[PDB]
Amino acid sequence: WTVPTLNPDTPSPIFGGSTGGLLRKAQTEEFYVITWEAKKEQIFEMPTGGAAIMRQGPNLLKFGKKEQCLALTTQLRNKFKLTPCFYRVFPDGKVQYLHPADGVYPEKVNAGRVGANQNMRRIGQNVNPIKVKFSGRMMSPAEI
Amino acid sequence: GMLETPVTSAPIVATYLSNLPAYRTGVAPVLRGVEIGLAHGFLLAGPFIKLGPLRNVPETAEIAGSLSAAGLVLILALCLSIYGSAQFQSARDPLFSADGWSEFAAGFLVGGEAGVAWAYVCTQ
Amino acid sequence: DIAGLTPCSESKAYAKLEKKELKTLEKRLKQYEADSAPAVALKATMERTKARFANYAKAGLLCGNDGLPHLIADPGLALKYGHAGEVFIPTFGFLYVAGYIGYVGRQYLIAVKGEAKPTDKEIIIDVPLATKLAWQGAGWPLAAVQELQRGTLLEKEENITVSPR
Amino acid sequence: MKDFTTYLSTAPVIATIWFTFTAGLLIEINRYFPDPLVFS
Amino acid sequence: AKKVKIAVDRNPVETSFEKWAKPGHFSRTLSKGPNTTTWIWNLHADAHDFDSHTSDLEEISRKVFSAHFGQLGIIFIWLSGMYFHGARFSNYEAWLSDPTHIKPSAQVVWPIVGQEILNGDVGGGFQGIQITSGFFQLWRASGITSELQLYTTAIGGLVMAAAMFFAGWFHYHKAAPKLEWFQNVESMLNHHLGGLLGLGSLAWAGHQIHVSLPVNKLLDAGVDPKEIPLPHDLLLNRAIMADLYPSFAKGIAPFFTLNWSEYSDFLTFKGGLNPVTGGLWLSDTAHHHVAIAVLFLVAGHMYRTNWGIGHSMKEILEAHRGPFTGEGHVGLYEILTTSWHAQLAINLALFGSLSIIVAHHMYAMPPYPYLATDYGTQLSLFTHHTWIGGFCIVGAGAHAAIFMVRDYDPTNNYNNLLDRVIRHRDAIISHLNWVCIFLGFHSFGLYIHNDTMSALGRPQDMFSDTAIQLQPVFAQWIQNTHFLAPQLTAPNALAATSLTWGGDLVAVGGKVAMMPISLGTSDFMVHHIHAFTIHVTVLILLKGVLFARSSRLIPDKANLGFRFPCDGPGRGGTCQVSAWDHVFLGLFWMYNSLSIVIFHFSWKMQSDVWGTVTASGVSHITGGNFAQSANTINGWLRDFLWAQSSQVIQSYGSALSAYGLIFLGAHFVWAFSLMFLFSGRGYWQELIESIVWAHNKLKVAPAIQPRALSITQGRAVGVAHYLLGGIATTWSFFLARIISVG
Amino acid sequence: GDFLVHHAIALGLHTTTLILVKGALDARGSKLMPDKKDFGYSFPCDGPGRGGTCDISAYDAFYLAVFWMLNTI
Amino acid sequence: AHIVKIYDTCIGCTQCVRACPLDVLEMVPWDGCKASQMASAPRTEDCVGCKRCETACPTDFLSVRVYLGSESTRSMGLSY
Ligand code: CLA
Ligand code: CLA
Ligand code: CLA
Ligand code: CLA
Ligand code: CLA
Ligand SMILES: CC1=C(C/C=C(\C)CCC[C@H](C)CCC[C@H](C)CCCC(C)C)C(=O)c2ccccc2C1=O
């Protein structure tokens, strides 16, 4: 598995449009692009409101925040049994790929992943807040 | 994309906006400030004169109302100035810059007060 | 008398209060017939009003300057001057009933904890058991004390869940 | 009939009968002993 | 071409008490029994949520149909009780003789714990609670003259109640209609238009023509009620009817020969109010129901069922297709024949709006004899039917959002009217948001302007009739147009429909029944308060429906459901995002808006309409202080709430003392509700932990684990107590006031 | 008349103390949130899980107690 | 950015990962439980603080904990 490269010329579903789409943020900070393959033309529900028809073959959509992309991904996987993937696109033209980070959806365990933010203790074994006081910033006992 | 609509996308509407001082590019920000300030300043005198606390006084009503319209233009000019200070601290149009907006605010004050004074002269 | 109060039987304001209430009833009476249904009802009310004011005076209550009965709560003052029936005696009257209700409910709750499905015995009451426990509760003060002395009234501190501290 | 008597044993039905009985007893006592304020 | 036919299933369900002894049987989740107290609340909350018990539409429809028979059976018991209590515990017979001096009463209390003082002196040698339901006026209009007639109706009411409960059992356990039966919308409309409304109107016209009109004609003439002919004597003896109405001498030949003008003596078009009784002419009311009967019977032959002729409702919807709306009304027919919630959303909306229209028309055109001069009945009926309409409309929003979450399917809705509305919801809510802000400033800000100018000693600067004026010129023009209608635009009408438009007052028994209502600056200001508070209620409810499925905050709100508390403290906090919470908030604003409506009505009537007629003129209850005082918030506080609450707070020791008690008790329930609204279950679950510890210490801890109410139930308990306390407070204040002075 | 009012004042003092005292003794944790100390004195909630935890912090106990203080005074 | 911590009582049910509406969590190999897998939080910069993961954790007390911290455009869930 290798990191996919986004194709900006991918066709988009048949959608009239709505007022729930991108705002000025997309032009200044970032936006998100989700792409997938469709076996047949079908009607799905846009997370921004309304219904759109997915073309047979590749499809591409642009959303304002990550949660909107992953909300559509859940719908496509659960009902239509598709395998979408989405990116983060910056105004400068850079494209960042994510979900699936390594090509396998996170629900399935995969070798090569490195545990992060894992504490080898229980919640009840954290230190008291007094012992992490005056540490330069508000710090919870869980952080240390 | 965005929901197309005649109000959002129509030829007649677009041409009208493109001729307004705010959208008429190629004009110095100061001159646009004067043109905008004059229009608002002239109108601003109306409500103060007719519905102010001294509206029923024969001759003082005109003076008091216009003098209050001049005051509001001064407050608005301050709002324009500080807005430029906060917004532009670091693009195509010169107006949306620290240098451009400061000239724009100055023109609004000059135009606005001129409009208020011009409105008074119309009455007397 | 006590705390500056006076017996209601000797209170001028108390007597005047009775006349006011009877006068109000009499005023409504004279707009009806002698033995019509409304007239009979009003006369019945007046009889109860006269009986009520005689009973409170006969009970030896104390009336204030307002001319209304006041109750004595201190056990020493109550037993000293024969006001035990106002608060003192009713105090032990209520506690017997309150302990009766609470003790009966506790007995039933313990009884069903031994059953296979205690939760279904709480929404759907076991009426035969409840009636059995209802009658045996008359001796709750005796049974309650004996549990206390035998040490089976309270749970052990080690068998009760508590939050981290 | 077993199920019907089980329905009457449900909490809402028992409470209605119990409070109907309890209220009736208190109402009847005050009907024959009106205006009780002191044990006497 | 599926034929319209009767279709049922035999013995679908067995009649047994087995499931009566197994609470929660209807739901898979609750069938296992309780482990925590939360189970108990869940049992009652989901009892009537049929759509969630089963996914079968046929099973859902059958439960709805029989649950409706139970509702009908309950109304008949209630109606039977009202007729029975009129026969046995009322002064109706005495009231017929002296309607203007005797107060209606149909409830008597037992002499226990000293409550017999509530049996007030109402007249006719009778003691009882004065009623404001208007049943005496209704019975007189229909021609009831004895308690025997009231008694027979009550017995008939119980027989109908028994029939309704049998029908519900029969059509669920014995012969349950199939799903295809329920989906004959064309057939149902035909029967309900021509059969329910149409024949119902014609049948009632028969009663009025043959019973109400003769009886009320003699009652108004002064004949003693006991000496009036019985209704069957009027029916059997055409000679008697001819004396009262000569048209009866010609029989029914004029009807079939089209000489309908022969019936002009009892089918009139007078308009106005009957001077003797102050209510609408019954001859006018009979011609109304005869005209309405024909209109609905014609209306019931519009839809096609089995014989070709008629309209297909699907075809009508699909033909109405324009350039601005894409596909159009396509797909609505399938929505409205497969979603009960969608049907309920429409019907609640219009049924509630109808109840509000009833309130306005009944006060302005009093339809019963002696209804107008009974100010307690006028105030109660207007206020009752406004509250009923308010709750129904809020329900319409609730069940529109339920449809949006559960029954909405994007595949069936693509580019149709419904889809396009969802695709510019931000445009709709943003514009409606601005309108509410605009209306709040320019209506309530005027009151704040007046209050400040008045406190500063600048009355000449206020918005009022003696100062800067705001005249409802448009409303005043309409009042004048309707006043002159009989001259040119309604030539065959003798009088204007109402005396509110203009003219002369009608006085019955020395009291004003109705007189022209003048609209001034205060009326201009209060009306734009109504528009403000109504528009805000639309904003809250419409926002909930349009954003039920998703928003820019929760992109997948549909999966969370219709009734959930939040999506957690993330994204800054998402408390109360569900569409259920938009009904919860909408209830407060509906209560706020209708409270001003019934305060506006109460003060305007007492100030400008109601009063006592004397030689000099009309003296009103509050003496015409609405015009000068209702333009400031201080005026409402002092002149309306503080002054008129004198009656309720002085009620102790009289027959109205009950209203005083409920006035305090209502204040209590309202304040009690703020405990649930201002707090959260996190505090209460920890409090119960310490309380449970004490019970554990004494071996008296319950087997069903105590739990603090859920988040949603806290909001539901809060709003229910808030509404009950607030509404009951006004209820006590209105009745103790109007009964005392009115 | 003074008897009834004084006992209402006692209700105010005891209930206000109850709310404040619970907010302090449960500040460090509880069965519904054993590790409340790790979140601080003032936080919104722990989410809708475990039945719902609105107004569970010690800050919220003080917030509810201010109402009872105003009522008592 | 919020703080998300996984504690050693995890049983590797994967319910937290499925629940997360922003793909913040993932499963990694482990030897401390029967399932031989543990939850991980490699992408906490995308966490919004909904606490759907905590709602889904079966262990008592929770094995995944979210401590709301500094706010940002991503953690505040803004599309503008
Ligand atoms: C709730 C607390 C309380 C309070 C404030 C009072 C107050 C009073 N009691 Mg009462 N009393 C109470 C509870 C209380 N009592 C209880 C629970 C009982 C047992 C059921 C009694 C039994 C009782 C008796 C038998 C007598 C009083 C008497 C008195 C008065 C003076 C002595 C006294 O008690 O001083 C302050 C109170 C206390 C410090 C609390 C304990 C009081 C004990 C139980 C009684 C003391 C009696 C005293 C030795 C009598 C000496 C003669 C006296 C004339 C000076 C006073 C009005 C006396 C009286 O009638 O005086 C006119 C009296 O003879 N009380
Ligand atoms: C004695 C006759 C009888 C019997 C034995 C049954 C038995 C059954 N019915 Mg049937 N049913 C009957 C009569 C009967 N029904 C009638 C008369 C109707 C017409 C309304 C229906 C309509 C009906 C429906 C629509 C359904 C059933 C269902 C059921 C099953 C469960 C019912 C249940 O749990 O009820 C227990 C419920 C109660 C005791 C609540 C009684 C509610 C009534 C309407 C009284 C309402 C009073 C009202 C709230 C008063 C105001 C309250 C306020 C003062 C507080 C069971 C097979 C259900 C089923 O089969 O599900 C699979 C079902 O969905 N029945
Ligand atoms: C639904 C409403 C309704 C009803 C039921 C009636 C009924 C009646 N009207 Mg009225 N009427 C109405 C509306 C109504 N009207 C309206 C809207 C108007 C205004 C246009 C009038 C204007 C009007 C006038 C002007 C007159 C009546 C009259 C009558 C009576 C005689 C009609 C007649 O000659 O029938 C003729 C025949 C029939 C209707 C057919 C009867 C069929 C029977 C019932 C069949 C029974 C068959 C059965 C098997 C036998 C029994 C067997 C068993 C014992 C074993 C009758 C009581 C007349 C009267 O007498 O007034 C006092 C009269 O003069 N009406
Ligand atoms: C024709 C009228 C109608 C009908 C048939 C329904 C039917 C339904 N509604 Mg809807 N609804 C209506 C009107 C109607 N609604 C109106 C007018 C409103 C606005 C207030 C709503 C608001 C509403 C909401 C917000 C919800 C529903 C829901 C439901 C469903 C479940 C209801 C349930 O289980 O209740 C069970 C019944 C109870 C628990 C009893 C409630 C008791 C109230 C609160 C008592 C109030 C005080 C009382 C009347 C007077 C004083 C009492 C005294 C003892 C002190 C069901 C399909 C629920 C659902 O899930 O739908 C899918 C839901 O969430 N409705
Ligand atoms: C008296 C209490 C009160 C007040 C004043 C408001 C005010 C408002 N609510 Mg709120 N609300 C309240 C109680 C109140 N609410 C309650 C108890 C609840 C819980 C049920 C809600 C629930 C609620 C919801 C759910 C909604 C509102 C909405 C609104 C807005 C309506 C439209 C608008 O902008 O009007 C104009 C504003 C006013 C009339 C406020 C007073 C303005 C004064 C009189 C004039 C301005 C002052 C002036 C500039 C001088 C300032 C000087 C100073 C700076 C020195 C408004 C901000 C709706 C909204 O946001 O619509 C857009 C909305 O959706 N409210
Ligand atoms: C007071 C309060 C509680 C506590 C209230 C509870 C637990 C409800 C209490 C209901 C009754 C009083 C308890 C159950 C009674 C039994 C049915 C037994 C009664 C037996 C006889 C006496 C009838 C919450 O749970 C809550 C939740 C969310 C927001 C606000 C609040 C809130 O304000």
Side-chain angles (χ1 to χ4, degrees):
Chain A
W1 173 91
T2 173
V3 180
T5 183
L6 178 61
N7 181 14
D9 293 0
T10 310
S12 58
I14 297 85
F15 186 58
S18 72
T19 62
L22 303 173
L23 293 170
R24 182 176 303 184
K25 177 197 168 192
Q27 298 180 344
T28 69
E29 188 169 344
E30 62 198 357
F31 68 92
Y32 299 77
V33 185
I34 182 178
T35 68
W36 73 97
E37 296 286 0
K39 304 170 184 176
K40 54 173 288 185
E41 287 197 4
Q42 191 175 14
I43 295 170
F44 64 99
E45 189 177 4
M46 297 284 292
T48 61
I53 314 177
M54 65 181 66
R55 307 172 182 276
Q56 176 169 347
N59 298 274
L60 188 152
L61 278 169
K62 294 154 61 178
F63 291 107
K65 67 182 181 180
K66 185 181 180 182
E67 186 181 1
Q68 287 173 350
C69 286
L70 192 56
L72 183 59
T73 289
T74 295
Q75 180 183 170
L76 298 176
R77 291 218 298 163
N78 290 7
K79 294 175 82 289
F80 311 134
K81 307 297 181 178
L82 304 179
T83 60
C85 63
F86 55 85
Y87 311 71
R88 180 184 282 107
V89 179
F90 302 92
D92 58 68
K94 180 185 173 183
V95 182
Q96 178 184 2
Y97 170 82
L98 29 76
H99 190 71
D102 60 352
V104 182
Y105 288 98
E107 65 180 31
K108 181 182 175 182
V109 66
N110 185 26
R113 293 172 179 172
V114 177
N117 299 313
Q118 293 174 344
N119 297 9
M120 302 306 166
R121 64 179 190 276
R122 310 196 311 277
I123 286 172
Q125 290 173 333
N126 289 340
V127 306
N128 296 305
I130 178 57
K131 301 300 183 62
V132 303
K133 195 179 180 188
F134 298 132
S135 53
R137 35 166 288 274
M138 295 177 66
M139 173 145 60
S140 298
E143 308 188 33
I144 68 99
Chain B
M2 67 183 299
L3 191 79
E4 78 302 319
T5 317
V7 181
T8 49
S9 59
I12 183 265
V13 165
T15 58
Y16 166 74
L17 294 173
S18 57
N19 297 335
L20 292 178
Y23 290 101
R24 201 197 298 101
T25 59
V27 184
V30 58
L31 302 181
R32 282 191 277 182
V34 174
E35 186 171 1
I36 295 176
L38 281 168
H40 293 100
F42 184 84
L43 305 172
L44 207 65
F48 284 104
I49 296 170
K50 258 59 185 61
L51 297 167
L54 298 175
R55 63 202 155 87
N56 298 128
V57 191
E59 296 185 14
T60 310
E62 305 290 338
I63 301 172
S66 62
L67 194 61
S68 59
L72 186 57
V73 171
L74 183 63
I75 297 167
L76 289 175
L78 180 64
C79 294
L80 280 169
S81 184
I82 65 181
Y83 173 88
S85 307
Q87 195 66 244
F88 315 109
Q89 304 183 46
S90 60
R92 188 89 294 175
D93 192 72
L95 183 69
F96 301 104
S97 60
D99 314 70
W101 195 274
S102 52
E103 304 182 18
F104 174 79
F108 179 85
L109 176 57
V110 176
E113 300 294 359
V116 173
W118 178 238
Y120 180 89
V121 172
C122 297
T123 63
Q124 294 186 356
Chain C
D1 189 73
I2 291 171
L5 302 178
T6 170
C8 297
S9 53
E10 309 174 357
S11 180
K12 301 298 187 182
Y14 179 85
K16 183 179 181 185
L17 188 66
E18 181 175 355
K19 299 183 70 176
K20 177 180 178 179
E21 299 196 17
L22 296 176
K23 190 193 298 180
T24 299
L25 297 169
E26 186 198 11
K27 192 175 180 178
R28 295 176 57 199
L29 184 61
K30 59 178 179 180
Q31 82 186 244
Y32 298 97
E33 298 174 339
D35 290 323
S36 58
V40 173
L42 284 167
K43 295 169 183 174
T45 297
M46 299 179 75
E47 285 295 345
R48 282 191 294 269
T49 302
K50 292 186 296 184
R52 190 196 315 117
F53 279 83
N55 292 24
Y56 294 172
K58 166 175 57 173
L61 300 183
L62 305 178
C63 275
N65 304 335
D66 48 68
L68 305 174
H70 294 181
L71 310 180
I72 303 304
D74 172 54
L77 288 168
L79 303 181
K80 180 78 172 188
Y81 303 103
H83 293 287
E86 296 175 349
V87 174
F88 177 81
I89 282 170
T91 301
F92 299 89
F94 166 86
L95 291 180
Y96 173 77
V97 177
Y100 199 141
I101 299 169
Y103 190 85
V104 168
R106 181 169 170 279
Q107 287 296 117
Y108 176 93
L109 218 58
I110 291 170
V112 305
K113 290 274 183 174
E115 296 295 357
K117 205 165 190 180
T119 53
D120 278 359
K121 304 301 294 297
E122 296 192 348
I123 54 170
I124 297 169
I125 308 305
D126 179 6
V127 175
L129 176 68
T131 55
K132 169 180 180 177
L133 300 171
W135 293 111
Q136 294 194 359
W140 78 263
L142 297 164
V145 168
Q146 295 299 349
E147 285 189 45
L148 173 54
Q149 287 166 341
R150 231 61 58 206
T152 64
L153 184 61
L154 304 179
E155 260 289 349
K156 300 179 182 177
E157 175 175 336
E158 58 172 14
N159 298 337
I160 305 175
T161 189
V162 293
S163 61
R165 46 203 56 178
Chain D
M1 234 304 178
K2 181 180 178 180
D3 290 336
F4 179 68
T5 59
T6 310
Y7 164 77
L8 302 180
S9 297
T10 53
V13 181
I14 291 293
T16 293
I17 304 170
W18 190 240
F19 295 146
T20 301
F21 169 84
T22 308
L25 183 74
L26 286 172
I27 292 163
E28 295 286 20
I29 290 167
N30 290 36
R31 176 155 70 95
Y32 287 88
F33 308 94
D35 301 336
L37 184 64
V38 45
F39 176 78
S40 62
Chain E
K2 297 181 178 180
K3 189 179 182 186
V4 185
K5 65 188 298 306
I6 299 161
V8 296
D9 283 325
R10 302 190 177 192
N11 302 332
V13 181
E14 181 190 10
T15 317
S16 310
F17 290 102
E18 171 180 342
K19 291 187 177 186
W20 294 37
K22 294 180 176 58
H25 66 86
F26 53 85
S27 64
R28 63 196 58 79
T29 296
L30 307 178
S31 296
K32 299 181 170 187
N35 194 340
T36 68
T37 64
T38 293
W39 176 94
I40 294 153
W41 307 114
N42 297 345
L43 181 65
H44 299 82
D46 289 311
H48 299 160
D49 197 359
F50 303 155
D51 312 70
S52 64
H53 304 170
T54 170
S55 193
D56 185 10
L57 188 56
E58 185 170 327
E59 185 178 10
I60 292 161
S61 306
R62 290 171 175 181
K63 296 183 177 189
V64 175
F65 189 45
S66 286
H68 288 181
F69 281 117
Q71 172 66 112
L72 292 179
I74 283 163
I75 296 173
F76 275 119
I77 291 169
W78 169 78
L79 260 173
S80 174
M82 301 305 91
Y83 277 85
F84 181 86
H85 280 248
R88 291 287 178 264
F89 304 110
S90 67
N91 64 348
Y92 176 72
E93 286 179 356
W95 180 83
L96 277 173
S97 307
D98 193 358
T100 52
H101 296 78
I102 296 176
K103 304 299 188 177
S105 176
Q107 182 181 336
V108 178
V109 314
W110 284 320
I112 195 70
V113 301
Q115 78 184 10
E116 57 268 10
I117 185 180
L118 298 183
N119 289 330
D121 308 323
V122 290
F126 182 79
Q127 291 180 330
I129 295 177
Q130 179 173 343
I131 57 167
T132 61
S133 54
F135 261 112
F136 284 25
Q137 286 82 351
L138 169 62
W139 294 334
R140 190 188 181 99
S142 62
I144 298 171
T145 33
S146 64
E147 291 166 2
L148 177 58
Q149 298 170 322
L150 296 177
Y151 181 82
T152 310
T153 316
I155 300 306
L158 289 174
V159 175
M160 292 302 301
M164 289 300 101
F165 284 108
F166 176 94
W169 166 85
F170 180 82
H171 284 307
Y172 191 78
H173 295 274
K174 222 71 193 175
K178 300 186 78 65
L179 182 61
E180 50 269 20
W181 186 81
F182 285 102
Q183 291 179 322
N184 295 279
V185 293
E186 275 84 352
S187 175
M188 196 186 300
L189 281 168
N190 279 8
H191 289 70
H192 286 181
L193 285 167
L196 179 55
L197 304 178
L199 296 182
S201 189
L202 182 63
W204 180 242
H207 181 93
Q208 295 193 311
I209 291 168
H210 293 286
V211 177
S212 306
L213 262 57
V215 171
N216 275 273
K217 186 179 184 185
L218 293 170
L219 278 169
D220 298 347
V223 179
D224 181 65
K226 187 177 176 182
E227 306 172 6
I228 306 177
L230 295 178
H232 51 93
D233 302 329
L234 300 164
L235 208 65
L236 294 166
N237 291 108
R238 180 184 287 104
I240 292 170
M241 290 290 292
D243 297 356
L244 304 169
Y245 302 100
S247 291
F248 273 77
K250 301 187 176 180
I252 57 176
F255 173 75
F256 287 98
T257 60
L258 301 186
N259 289 17
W260 292 0
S261 301
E262 300 292 354
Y263 300 142
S264 296
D265 52 0
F266 68 93
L267 293 181
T268 64
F269 216 118
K270 298 181 173 181
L273 295 174
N274 184 11
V276 48
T277 61
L280 297 174
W281 300 100
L282 295 180
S283 62
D284 258 66
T285 301
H287 194 187
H288 166 87
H289 286 110
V290 173
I292 291 286
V294 176
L295 182 62
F296 279 134
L297 277 163
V298 171
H301 291 86
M302 179 181 169
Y303 302 106
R304 170 195 314 165
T305 54
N306 274 338
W307 299 275
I309 60 178
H311 290 276
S312 176
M313 301 188 71
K314 178 177 179 180
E315 294 176 355
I316 298 171
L317 290 165
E318 294 180 346
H320 288 78
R321 180 194 189 94
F324 297 89
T325 50
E327 290 189 355
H329 299 92
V330 168
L332 291 179
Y333 187 81
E334 297 80 352
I335 283 170
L336 287 168
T337 53
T338 47
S339 183
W340 279 99
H341 291 294
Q343 285 279 352
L344 185 52
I346 295 173
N347 299 347
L348 280 171
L350 275 79
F351 209 56
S353 298
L354 182 66
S355 183
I356 285 162
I357 293 166
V358 165
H360 270 276
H361 289 189
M362 287 188 68
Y363 96 83
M365 297 166 287
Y368 301 110
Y370 302 100
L371 181 71
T373 47
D374 188 1
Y375 299 151
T377 305
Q378 282 277 63
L379 183 64
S380 294
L381 291 181
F382 178 94
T383 301
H384 171 86
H385 286 106
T386 306
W387 282 120
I388 296 303
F391 278 97
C392 283
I393 291 173
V394 175
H399 289 284
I402 293 161
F403 159 84
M404 219 71 184
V405 173
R406 295 185 182 178
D407 296 0
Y408 168 90
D409 177 60
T411 67
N412 305 327
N413 297 278
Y414 177 81
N415 200 20
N416 60 336
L417 289 169
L418 177 61
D419 182 62
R420 300 168 70 79
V421 164
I422 303 170
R423 280 160 51 194
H424 71 289
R425 59 188 177 184
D426 307 73
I428 306 177
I429 298 306
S430 59
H431 281 75
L432 181 53
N433 188 330
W434 166 82
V435 171
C436 301
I437 302 173
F438 168 89
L439 280 172
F441 279 137
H442 291 83
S443 54
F444 174 73
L446 304 177
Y447 284 89
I448 300 299
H449 173 99
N450 283 339
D451 263 308
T452 313
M453 293 296 99
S454 184
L456 291 172
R458 321 232 307 263
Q460 68 282 356
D461 296 340
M462 296 169 60
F463 293 109
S464 55
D465 292 331
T466 53
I468 304 170
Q469 296 194 7
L470 304 166
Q471 296 292 345
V473 297
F474 301 149
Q476 293 166 354
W477 187 85
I478 291 175
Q479 282 192 298
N480 178 23
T481 298
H482 296 169
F483 177 54
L484 305 180
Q487 297 176 2
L488 180 58
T489 60
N492 290 337
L494 303 183
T497 73
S498 185
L499 286 169
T500 52
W501 314 124
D504 295 329
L505 81 178
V506 168
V508 181
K511 303 174 66 176
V512 179
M514 184 54 59
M515 62 190 300
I517 291 173
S518 60
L519 301 182
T521 296
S522 288
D523 302 293
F524 179 95
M525 296 174 67
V526 77
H527 267 91
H528 284 81
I529 294 293
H530 301 330
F532 162 59
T533 57
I534 288 172
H535 269 87
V536 175
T537 307
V538 177
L539 170 62
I540 302 170
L541 299 175
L542 183 58
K543 176 178 181 285
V545 175
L546 294 181
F547 289 91
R549 298 191 62 78
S550 67
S551 61
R552 255 180 260 263
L553 186 59
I554 317 298
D556 57 321
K557 204 187 297 186
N559 294 329
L560 296 187
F562 163 74
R563 187 176 65 203
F564 56 99
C566 65
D567 196 7
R571 318 179 193 84
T574 56
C575 325
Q576 295 181 3
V577 288
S578 67
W580 186 96
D581 292 302
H582 290 63
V583 189
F584 158 78
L585 291 176
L587 279 164
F588 291 100
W589 263 95
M590 183 278 296
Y591 167 78
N592 193 37
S593 81
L594 296 199
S595 298
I596 308 311
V597 168
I598 64 177
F599 284 0
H600 171 198
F601 176 85
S602 185
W603 196 1
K604 185 67 175 177
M605 290 295 137
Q606 297 180 41
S607 172
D608 293 335
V609 180
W610 296 341
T612 65
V613 176
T614 48
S616 63
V618 183
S619 63
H620 303 283
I621 291 170
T622 63
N625 62 341
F626 183 90
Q628 302 187 0
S629 304
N631 58 9
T632 56
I633 306 303
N634 202 30
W636 286 83
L637 188 77
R638 181 185 58 262
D639 293 322
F640 186 69
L641 280 180
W642 178 92
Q644 300 193 11
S645 47
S646 174
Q647 277 68 31
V648 61
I649 64 182
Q650 298 170 19
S651 58
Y652 283 12
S654 56
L656 302 180
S657 62
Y659 295 105
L661 294 167
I662 300 174
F663 189 69
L664 292 175
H667 267 90
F668 176 91
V669 172
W670 177 85
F672 177 80
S673 79
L674 304 178
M675 182 163 60
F676 302 86
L677 300 165
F678 296 172
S679 60
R681 73 178 306 280
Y683 170 86
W684 299 102
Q685 190 58 84
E686 293 184 10
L687 183 60
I688 288 176
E689 290 165 12
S690 304
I691 291 165
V692 168
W693 172 93
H695 291 70
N696 282 319
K697 188 67 171 187
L698 284 162
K699 298 173 178 184
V700 70
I704 298 168
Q705 301 177 98
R707 291 288 193 263
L709 310 181
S710 63
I711 296 166
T712 286
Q713 192 186 340
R715 295 164 183 172
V717 170
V719 70
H721 287 79
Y722 190 107
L723 292 160
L724 175 55
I727 292 174
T729 310
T730 299
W731 175 91
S732 312
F733 156 64
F734 273 9
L735 300 200
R737 164 64 175 187
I738 197 62
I739 286 168
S740 180
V741 306
Chain F
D2 311 82
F3 170 94
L4 284 160
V5 181
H6 265 92
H7 283 76
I9 291 170
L11 166 63
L13 299 187
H14 280 96
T15 305
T16 308
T17 301
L18 166 58
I19 304 169
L20 291 165
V21 161
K22 182 192 158 296
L25 296 176
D26 288 2
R28 289 178 60 80
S30 56
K31 304 249 66 179
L32 179 57
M33 195 168 175
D35 64 328
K36 199 193 296 175
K37 61 192 182 182
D38 303 340
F39 291 75
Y41 175 73
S42 182
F43 55 96
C45 61
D46 214 21
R50 307 197 303 279
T53 57
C54 318
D55 288 82
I56 195 170
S57 68
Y59 178 90
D60 305 311
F62 158 87
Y63 147 76
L64 291 163
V66 172
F67 294 105
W68 259 98
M69 180 275 292
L70 290 170
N71 181 58
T72 311
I73 300 301
Chain G
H2 300 337
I3 305 177
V4 185
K5 295 293 182 178
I6 312 297
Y7 292 88
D8 61 356
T9 52
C10 174
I11 62 174
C13 64
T14 72
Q15 298 309 325
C16 58
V17 179
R18 303 179 188 274
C20 185
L22 287 117
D23 185 1
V24 169
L25 308 170
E26 66 182 7
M27 303 302 300
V28 306
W30 198 32
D31 60 318
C33 59
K34 181 179 179 182
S36 66
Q37 54 185 3
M38 189 180 178
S40 186
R43 292 175 289 277
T44 52
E45 73 287 359
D46 293 323
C47 181
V48 300
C50 63
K51 291 168 172 289
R52 288 194 197 178
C53 48
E54 297 181 348
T55 304
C57 193
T59 64
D60 167 72
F61 196 49
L62 300 164
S63 301
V64 55
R65 213 71 171 94
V66 182
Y67 306 88
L68 302 193
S70 294
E71 297 293 357
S72 67
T73 294
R74 297 184 192 172
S75 79
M76 210 75 168
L78 301 180
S79 48
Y80 58 88

